[PDB]
C-alpha cells in the first residue's frame with residue numbers, strides 16, 4: 001500500500017555537526033535503516049564536497065537523481081544507492097548527498113526530494 005514515491009523535506013547538515021555518522025555495518029542494514037529514518041522524519045542529508053566522505057562511516061547511503069523531467073512541486077525525484085569499499089548497490093543519476101541519522105542537529109537548509117520507496 002506504500003505509494004511508490006514520497007515528498008520529503010530533508011534537513012541538510014554540515015558534516016562536522018553530524019553525531020551519528022552512518023546507518024549501520026552492512027549494505028543491507030544501511031539501506032534498511034535509512035528507509036526507516038526517512039519514514040520517521042529522522043534522516044538528514046550531507047552534501048558531498050572534498051573531505052566529507054572520509055568524515056562519515058561506510059557503508060554510505062546516497063540519494064541520487066532518478067530522472068530528468070520530474071520535480072513535482074519543487075521536489076527532485078531521487079532513489080537510494082549504497083556504497084561499500086568502492087562498490088555501489090544500485091545505479092542512478094547524480095548524487096544529491098549522503099544520508100545520515102538526524103538526532104536534532106541544526107540544519108543549514110532543507111532539501112526537497114521525491115523519494116522512491118524501494
Ligand SMILES: Nc1nc2ccccc2s1
Nearest residue numbers: 002006035038039117118
Ligand atoms: N520501504 C519503505 N521505504 C521508505 C522510505 C521512505 C519513507 C517510507 C518508506 S517505507
